[PDB]
C-alpha cells in the first residue's frame, strides 16, 4: 500500500515534464497545468468518488503528509537552488534595493494583505490568522520569477533587482510567516516574547546557516576529486541545517538553508571542482523543479479535497468572490510596497526607473514557496486555534492567488514588457550580435573546410549543414569610443579564452564594459563599473596587529585583495592593447587621439590601486600573479585530461592518476594562495637574463647586498644625453622612456618591464643617454657599473650576448611601432634564434639587409645606395626601403629575420580558379 | 515525529561522505563503515536502549520501513546507474561470456549456497527457504565491483568481464529471488505456475522495460534544449516503469528498471544532449551513492535491531559458526560455478585464462543488492511462512555475508592482482604514458610563457607552478609496427580533436589499436578489434520488400550502416596518413616497407565494406558523411557559444536564442538521417569545379543525359601514352594512377577524388597521357570530349584557369613527395592565391624561380646553367637545385610561392643569449 506514493512520485513528475515540454514558448508557465490537473484529479478522488485504483491510492497516501515533513522535504528543496545560483557581484550592486524590497518591502504587503483580509473578508478571522495569510502570500516565487526573466528579455540591473528581491522575499515572508504561525498557536503573546522569538528564529537560523557553510566550505577544500560526494554533501549539510534549526535549535530552518546556500555561492565557488559545478547546478536546479512539480500538483489535489468536503467551500460564492477579491489586494499591496519604497529604491544600487518600477509591481508571481506554507497550514489545520475550514480556505485562497498571478502575471508582463519599448536591444549590442553570428558562419565554413578533404565517405553537402545553422565613421566621437570598447571587450574575451583571467573576473569585467557601452556619448566609464571591485580600505595589518606572525599577513593580503588585483591588471591590460588597436584601426585622427588619452587619463585609479598594494603589501602581487598562472596551467592540464579520457588512449588507472594530481593540485591552490619565496637581491640577480654574463665571483659580495633594489615611482633613472655610469637590471616594476632626440614618433606604450637591463648600448658604446627613464611603479632596480660590465669584454661569447642585449632594447627603442606590442621574451625569441647573426663589419663592406628581415646598427657609420650621401648614426635600425648601405667606417650591425576583429568588424571584412575552388569545397558557391 | 526521518537520511549520508573521504585509496570500502556504524547505533538505540533523542526517532521510523516500498525506492536508485552506465561495444564483444556467467552461473550458485544451508544449518529451513537464501546472496553488488574495479588496475577485459557479470547477476538473482520468495509464501506450487511466473516476471518485465524505454528515448528525441527534464524524464521512467512491472503487470520492477538502463545506454546516446551527459552520469551516481549508503546505514541497524531482540541471534554461537560456514560456502560456490562455466568460458567473447579466473572468483562482492532484498524479507518476516527468527537470520547472514567479502575481498584482490604479475603495465602503454607526460609538461611550460608578459602583475614563480604540477631502432620490424600503431592512434587522437569521427568511434578505433599494440610482434591486427563493428549481412531492402517507398529505405540503411561506415573510413585515414608518417620517419628501410605492405593489406576488408555501401546503397555515404561534418560543425558551435556564456558577452535572451538553435539542430541531426537529394549529372556537372569553363550552353544537352556517371572498381579510366581523347570529372570515388614514364617514386598513396578533373594537360597541349588511371572504387565519373574543351580556348581568363587546374593535377603527378597528402582544396588554394603566376614566355627568356616557392613548366622546353645542357620535357616541376633555366622553345609555366609526436616521440624531441632567455621566462633555468 505505501509502495503507491512512489507511483504518485511518478505520475507527478511525468505529467510536469509534460506541461513543461508542452507549454514551453508559450508565455504560460507549465505550474497552472500542474495545479490544474492536481486540481482535477483530487476531484476525482475526493468530489467525485470515483474508484482511481492505484493513482488514487498515492493521492490519499500524499494527502495525508505531515505539514512539518512536508515543509523538511520540499522547502529546502525549492530554496536552495534559488540562493546557491546567486550570483555574488550583481547582489553586491544591488544589496541597498534588495534589502529594501526584502524586509520592508514584504513587512508593508503583509500589513497591507492582512489588514484588507481582516477588514473586508466574511470569515470572522483574527488579526493573527488575517496577517498569518497576508505575510503567506506575500512570498513572491523564485523560481517562477526567475523561468519568466529567461524569457522575458529584461536588462540585467532589472532582471538582478527582480530575482535578487524575490529569493529574499522568501526568506522574510517565511519568518513573519513563522512569526504569525506561532502567534495564532497561542504563543507569541507579549512584545518581549515577540522580540526573543524572532532574535532566534533570525539570528540563530542565520548562524546555523553559517556555521554549517564554514564547515562544509572546509571540507569541500579538503575533497580533492570526487564530484558526488561534493554534491550529496551539499543535499546532507542543506537537510542537517534545516533539521538542526527547526527541531534543534527551534530557529527557522528555511532561512538556514537560504544562508547555507548564499554562503556556497559567496565563499564555495572554488570550494567545488570546476567541472563539478555545472552538475551540481542542474542536480539542484533539477530538485526545485521536482519540489515544484510535487507541491503543485500536491496543492492541486488538497485544494480539491477541502473545497468539495461536507462544507463544498468550492460551492460557497464567498469563496470565488473573495478570492478575486485577494488578487487585486495582491496588486494594490505590491503597488503600494513599490511606490512606498520607490523614492529609496531609485537611490540605492541600480537606479529604478518609473518603467523598471511597473516591471517590478507587475512581476509579482507567486509560487510553491506560499503553495507549501499554506499546504503545511491546511495539513495541520482542523484544532482549536486553525480550524479546519480556515485551512482549507488559506490553502483555497494561496492556491488560487498563486493561479491567478502566474495566469495573469507571467503570460502579461511580456506584454507589459514589449509595451513601454523595453524590449529593444540598443545598437551596440545588435552589432556585437551581429559579429558573433558572423563569427560562427566563419567557424561552420571552417569546420566545412577541415572535413571536405575525406576520400572514402566522400564529399558533404553544404546545403544541408546549412538548413542546420540557417539561424545564425572615423569622424564621430560616439563610434570610435564604442569601437574602443569593442575592443576593450575583444581583448577581455581573448585572456579569458588564454586563461590570464577567470570566469568571474571575466564577467565583471565585461559588465563593466557593457556599462561602459551606453554612455560613449560621455567619456569613457569603463572603470565606473569596476570601481565597487577595487577598494584598498586599511593596511593596520602593520602596526604590530598581525606582525608577529607575519605569515598570516599575506594570507589576509592577498585574499582581501586577489580579485582587485586581478580586475586592475586585466583593466590596464585590456585598455593597452585596445589602446594599440585603436591607433592601428585608425591610424593618426585626431578623434583617435583623444579616445587615447581619454582611456590613458581613466586608467589612472587602476595604477593607483596597484601602487597601494605594491608599497603596503610588496609579496602579494608576485603570490597573485603565481596563483593565477599556475590556474591557467592547471586548467590546462585539465583539459589535455579530458580529452585523453574522451579518446580512451591511458588506462583507467593511470589517465585516473594524472586527473586526481591535477585535481589536487588545484584544490591546493583555491585552498591557500601559493606559498611564494621573497626574492632577495641575490636570487633577483641570479634571475635576471644578464646573471648569464655576470660571472659568480661578481655575483657574490656579500650577494651584492647594501642596495634596496625597491625605487619609488617618479624616480628617475638615468637622464638623458648622460654619460654611460652604468646599467640598470629591472627585476619588477615598470619604466617609462621619454627622448625628443631618438624618433619616437607615435610610441604609444613606451614601456619596460621585469627581466629587463637598460643601458647597456651606452655603456657598451660610449654614446650619451638615448631616452629619459622614470619609474613608472615601484620598480626592484639594482645599479651594476659600468666597469663591471666593461670587464665583461675579454671574450667574444659574453660580447655578442650584452650587444644582443642592446639589440632588444634599441628594437623596442628605435622601432616601437612593431616592437613595443610584443613581450620581451618573445623579442629575446626573435634575437636569440640560431638565423640571427651579429657581425662585425670591416670598412668599405656591405650590409644585407633583405626581404622578410630585420636589421639594426650598433657601432659605426653606414652610406646608402640611390639617395643623397647620408652620415647615420650608430642606432639606426636599418630596414629595407624597398622590402644598399655601404660600411662606412668600423661598424657593427646585427640583422633578423622577423576576437581581434569586434572594433573593426564591418570593416575588416572573381577569378575562375577562385570560383571553381568555392566548388571544390562547397555545393554550388557560397559567399564565404 | 515524522520529521525525523529526513534527520535520519541526513546524519547517513553525513557518515557516507566522511567513510567514503576517509577510507578513499585504503583498500577497505567505506560502506564495511557504513554497516559498522549502522550497527553500533542500532546497538545503541535497541540493545543498550539508550536515549538517542531525535536520532532514535529517525532511526526507528526507517526500521518500520515497507518492505515493498523499500524495494521500490531502492533497488532502482541502486541500479540504473549501473545499467546505465554500462557500454555497449564492450558488452557486444563480451556477452556470451556475460550472459554464461549471469544465468547459469547464478543458477549453480544458487542450487550450491541452498543445497548447502539446507543440509547444513541447524534452523531445519525448507528447500524453499533455503534456496531463497541462496539466491539472495548470490548476486554480486555492481555498485561495489565497479569501485573495486578504479582502484584495482586490472586489464580492461577482465574489468568488463567482471563488471558485465556483476550487474548481470543481479538480474538474474534477483528474479530467482522473487520465484523463491513466492514459493515461501505458499505459491508456485506447480512446474507449471513456475514456468508461467518465470515467464511474466522475467519477459514481461523485459517488456515494459523495453516500451517505456522506446517512448521515453522518443520522448528525448523530441526534447530540444532542456537538460533538466532530461534528467527527471530518467527519474520518472524509471520510477514509473518499476511500478508499472511490480504492481500493475506483476513482473519483476528490478528487471524492467535493468532493462530500461540498458536501453539508455544502447539506443539513448544520442537521444540525450551531448552536455546532458555528464550531469545525468554525475545525478546517478550519486542517486546510487545515497541509496547503497541508507541501504547499508539502515541494514546495520535492523541487523542490530533483530539480533538484540528477546531471542538474541547475536548471542547464540551457531549465528556466528555459520556465518563463517555461510562466507566459506559462498567461496566455494563462486569456485564451483567458475570452474564449470571456465571450458566455455575461455573459448567465448574474451578469452580467460587462469589468472584472470582467480579475479573472477575472488571478485565475489556482495553489496546493497543482497543487503536490500535480505532487509525486504526480515521487514515482511513475523508472518506464518517466513518467520520472525527466519528474517532476522536471513538479513544477519546476509549483512555479514556482505561485510565479510567486502573486508576479505576487497581489500586482498588488490594483493592477489599484484601477486600474479597482472599489475605490471606492458612497454607500448608505458611509453604512451611517458609520451602524454611529457605532452603535459610541454602544455604547461607553453602556459607559462604565454602569461610571463605581465606589467602590472609583475613575473609568476616557477617553482611554485612546477611544484604544482610535481607529479608529471629502425632495424626491428617489431619496433617498427609499434611505432606504426603509435601513428595510428596518433591520427585517430587528432581526427576525434579536429571532429571528424566521434568518442564513441574514437573510442572504439583506440581499443581495436590498444589490441593490436599486444601483437606487434606478429603482422599488424588493428582491423581485428574493428572486424566485429564493420559488417553487411543483408540488402534485402532491393528484393521489392521495401522499395515502395524508397524513402524508408535510406534511413534503415543509414542507421544500420552509420558507425561501420565511420569506423571504416577513419581506419582507412588513419592507416594512409600513418602510413605517409612511418615513410618520413624511417625513409627507405626494408622494415618501414614491409610494415607500410602489412597495413595496406590489412586495410582490405575496410574498403571491401566501403564498396559494398557504395555498390548496394549509393546514397548512404552521402548522408552519413554530411551527418558527420554537420555533427562536427554543430559542436563547434556548440563550443563558441559555450565560450560566449562563459565570458558573459551576449544579451541572456541572445544567447540562449543561439543555444537553443545549435541544440535544436543538433537533436534533429540524431533524430533523423538528413535528407540529402540524391545529385543528378546536372547538378553534379554544376557542382565541380570545372563547370565554371563550362559555359551554361555546354551544360544543358538535356542535362548532358545518356550517360550513367557511375563506374566500377578496376575499370580503367584511360591508358598511359594513349591520344588525349578528353578529360574526366570525378565527381566521387577515388581513382589510382600508375607511370612508369613518370619520376614516380616514393608515390605511397596516388589518388584523386571528388572534385577533380583528369586529363586537362593532355588535351591543353596534345602529349599523350602521362599516367593510368585505373578506378580503385565506385566512381561517379563524367567524360566530356577534346573538343569540347578545346573550343573553350577562346578567352585567356579561362586558358589561365584549365592551366590552374593542369598544375594542380601535375603538382599531385610530378611532385608527390609533398603534394600528395595534401587535400585538393589547399593545393587549390595554393594555385589559386593572387601570387601565383601563370606566364607564357618567349624563348630566350627566364623563369624566377626563387626561395619559398615552387614552379612547374606546363608546354614548352627549358636549359638550366650550370650543369650540361639538359632539354627538360614539358611536364618538369622546375624545383630550385640551390635553394638558370634560360628558356628555349615557347614555354608555359606557373610559379607557385608554396599529437603527430607519438610516432617518434623519444627521437623527435647553449647560447649566451638562449640561456639569458630561459631567465627571463622561467625563474632560474629549466631543461624545456
Ligand atoms: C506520509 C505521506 C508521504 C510522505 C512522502 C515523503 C516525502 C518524500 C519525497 C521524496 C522525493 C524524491 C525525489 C527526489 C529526486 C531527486
Ligand atoms: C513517514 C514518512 C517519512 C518520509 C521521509 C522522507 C525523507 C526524505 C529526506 C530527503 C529528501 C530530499 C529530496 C527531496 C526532493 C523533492
Ligand atoms: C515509512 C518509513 C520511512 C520511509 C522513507 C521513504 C523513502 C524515502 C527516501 C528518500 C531519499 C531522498 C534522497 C534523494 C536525493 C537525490
Ligand atoms: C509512507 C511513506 C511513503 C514514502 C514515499 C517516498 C516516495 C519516493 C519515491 C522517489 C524516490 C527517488 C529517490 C531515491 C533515492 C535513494
Chains 1, 2 share one sequence.
Not at 534549526?245 to 548564499?262: D, F, H, K, N, R
Not at 588619452?597 to 597573485?624: D, H, I, T, Y
Amino acid at each position: 500500500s505505501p509502495v503507491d506514493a512512489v507511483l504518485f512520485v511518478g505520475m507527478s513528475l511525468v505529467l510536469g515534464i509534460a506541461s513543461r515540454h508542452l507549454l514551453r514558448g508559450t508565455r504560460v508557465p507549465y505550474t497552472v497545468a500542474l495545479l490544474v490537473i492536481g486540481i482535477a484529479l483530487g476531484s476525482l478522488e475526493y468530489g467525485a468518488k470515483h474508484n482511481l485504483g492505484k493513482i488514487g491510492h498515492g493521492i490519499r497516501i500524499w494527502n495525508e503528509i505531515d505539514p512539518e515533513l512536508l515543509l523538511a522535504v520540499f522547502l529546502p528543496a525549492l530554496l536552495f537552488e534559488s540562493s546557491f545560483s546567486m550570483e555574488v557581484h550583481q547582489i553586491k550592486r544591488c544589496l541597498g534595493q534588495m534589502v529594501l524590497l526584502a524586509v520592508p518591502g514584504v513587512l508593508i504587503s503583509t500589513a497591507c494583505l492582512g489588514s484588507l483580509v481582516k477588514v473586508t473578508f466574511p470569515y470572522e478571522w483574527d488579526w493573527k490568522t488575517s496577517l498569518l495569510l497576508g505575510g503567506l502570500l506575500s512570498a513572491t516565487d523564485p523560481v517562477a520569477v526567475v523561468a519568466l526573466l529567461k524569457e522575458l528579455g529584461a536588462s540585467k540591473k532589472l532582471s538582478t533587482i527582480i530575482e535578487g528581491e524575490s529569493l529574499m522575499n522568501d526568506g522574510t515572508a517565511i519568518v513573519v510567516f513563522q512569526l504569525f504561525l506561532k502567534m495564532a498557536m497561542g504563543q507569541n503573546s507579549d512584545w518581549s516574547s515577540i522580540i526573543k522569538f524572532l532574535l532566534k528564529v533570525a539570528l540563530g537560523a542565520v548562524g546555523i546557516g553559517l556555521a554549517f557553510g564554514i564547515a562544509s566550505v572546509i571540507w569541500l577544500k579538503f575533497i580533492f576529486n570526487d564530484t558526488v560526494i561534493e554534491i550529496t554533501l551539499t543535499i546532507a549539510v542543506s537537510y542537517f541545517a534545516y533539521y538542526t534549526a527547526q527541531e534543534w535549535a527551534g530557529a527557522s530552518g528555511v532561512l538556514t538553508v537560504m544562508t547555507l546556500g548564499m554562503f556556497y555561492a559567496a565563499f564555495a565557488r572554488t570550494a567545488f571542482k570546476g567541472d563539478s559545478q555545472k552538475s551540481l547546478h542542474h542536480f539542484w536546479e533539477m530538485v526545485a523543479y521536482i519540489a515544484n512539480t510535487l507541491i503543485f500538483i500536491l496543492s492541486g489535489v488538497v485544494i480539491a479535497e477541502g473545497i468539495l468536503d461536507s462544507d463544498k467551500i468550492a460551492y460557497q460564492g464567498n469563496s470565488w468572490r473573495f478570492l478575486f477579491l485577494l488578487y487585486v489586494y495582491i496588486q494594490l499591496s505590491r503597488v503600494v510596497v513599490v511606490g512606498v519604497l520607490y523614492p529609496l529604491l531609485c537611490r540605492f544600487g541600480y537606479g529604478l526607473d518609473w518603467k523598471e518600477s511597473i516591471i517590478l509591481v507587475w512581476s509579482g508571481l507567486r509560487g510553491a514557496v506560499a503553495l507549501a506554507l499554506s499546504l503545511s497550514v491546511k495539513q495541520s489545520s482542523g484544532n482549536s486555534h486553525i480550524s479546519k475550514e480556515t485551512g482549507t480556505l488559506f490553502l483555497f485562497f494561496t492556491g488560487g492567488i498563486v493561479f491567478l498571478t502566474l495566469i495573469v502575471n507571467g503570460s502579461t508582463t511580456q506584454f507589459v514588457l514589449r509595451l513601454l519599448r523595453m524590449d529593444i536591444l540598443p545598437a551596440p549590442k545588435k552589432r556585437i550580435l551581429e559579429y558573433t553570428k558572423y563569427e560562427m558562419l566563419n567557424k561552420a565554413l571552417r569546420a566545412f573546410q577541415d572535413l571536405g578533404d575525406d576520400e572514402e565517405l566522400g564529399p558533404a553537402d553544404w546545403p544541408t549543414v546549412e538548413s542546420y545553422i540557417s539561424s545564425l565613421d572615423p569622424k564621430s566621437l560616439k563610434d570610435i569610443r564604442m569601437r574602443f570598447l569593442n575592443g576593450v571587450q575583444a581583448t577581455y574575451w581573448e585572456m579569458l579564452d588564454e586563461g590570464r583571467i577567470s570566469e568571474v573576473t571575466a564577467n565583471i569585467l565585461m559588465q563593466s564594459v557593457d556599462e561602459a557601452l551606453d554612455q560613449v556619448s560621455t567619456t569613457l566609464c569603463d572603470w565606473r563599473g569596476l570601481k565597487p571591485h577595487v577598494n584598498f580600505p586599511n593596511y593596520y595589518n602593520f602596526l604590530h596587529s598581525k606582525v608577529v606572525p607575519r605569515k598570516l599577513v599575506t594570507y589576509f593580503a592577498v585574499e582581501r585583495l586577489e580579485s582587485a588585483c586581478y580586475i586592475s591588471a586585466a583593466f590596464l591590460r585590456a585598455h593597452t592593447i585596445a589602446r594599440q588597436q585603436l591607433y592601428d584601426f585608425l591610424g593618426e585622427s585626431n578623434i583617435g587621439s583623444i579616445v587615447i588619452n581619454e582611456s590613458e587619463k581613466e586608467g589612472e585609479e587602476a595604477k593607483k590601486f596597484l601602487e597601494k598594494v605594491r608599497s603596503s603589501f610588496p609579496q602579494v602581487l608576485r603570490v597573485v600573479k603565481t596563483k593565477q598562472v599556475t590556474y591557467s596551467v592547471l586548467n590546462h592540464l585539465l583539459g589535455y585530461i579530458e580529452n585523453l579520457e574522451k579518446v580512451g588512449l591511458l588506462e583507467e588507472k593511470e589517465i585516473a592518476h594524472l586527473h586526481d594530481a591535477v585535481q589536487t593540485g588545484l584544490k591546493k591552490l583555491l585552498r591557500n594562495p601559493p606559498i611564494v619565496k621573497l626574492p632577495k637581491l641575490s636570487d633577483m640577480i641570479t634571475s635576471h637574463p644578464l646573471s648569464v654574463a655576470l660571472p659568480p665571483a661578481f655575483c657574490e659580495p656579500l650577494k651584492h647586498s647594501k642596495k634596496e633594489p625597491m625605487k619609488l615611482r617618479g624616480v628617475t633613472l638615468y637622464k638623458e644625453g648622460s654619460k654611460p655610469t652604468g646599467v640598470w637590471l629591472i627585476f619588477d616594476g615598470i619604466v617609462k622612456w621619454k627622448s625628443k632626440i631618438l624618433s619616437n614618433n607615435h610610441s604609444l606604450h613606451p614601456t619596460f618591464s621585469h627581466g629587463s637591463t637598460l643601458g647597456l648600448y651606452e655603456v657598451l658604446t660610449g654614446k650619451p643617454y638615448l631616452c629619459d627613464l622614470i619609474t613608472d611603479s615601484m620598480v626592484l632596480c639594482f645599479f651594476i657599473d659600468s666597469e663591471k660590465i666593461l670587464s665583461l669584454q675579454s671574450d667574444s661569447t659574453i660580447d655578442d650576448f650584452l650587444w644582443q642585449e642592446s639589440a632588444l632594447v634599441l628594437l623596442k627603442l628605435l622601432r616601437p611601432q612593431i616592437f613595443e606590442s610584443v613581450a620581451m621574451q618573445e623579442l629575446r625569441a626573435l634575437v636569440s634564434t640560431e638565423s640571427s647573426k651579429l657581425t662585425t663589419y670591416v670598412t668599405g663592406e656591405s650590409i644585407e639587409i633583405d626581404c622578410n628581415s630585420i636589421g639594426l646598427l650598433l657601432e659605426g657609420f653606414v652610406k646608402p645606395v640611390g639617395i643623397k650621401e647620408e652620415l647615420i648614426s650608430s642606432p639606426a635600425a636599418l630596414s629595407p626601403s624597398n622590402g644598399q648601405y655601404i660600411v662606412e667606417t668600423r661598424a657593427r650591425a646585427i640583422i633578423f629575420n622577423i576576437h581581434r576583429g569586434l572594433m573593426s568588424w564591418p570593416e575588416n571584412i572573381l577569378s575562375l580558379s577562385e570560383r571553381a575552388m568555392q566548388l571544390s569545397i562547397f555545393g554550388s558557391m557560397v559567399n564565404v
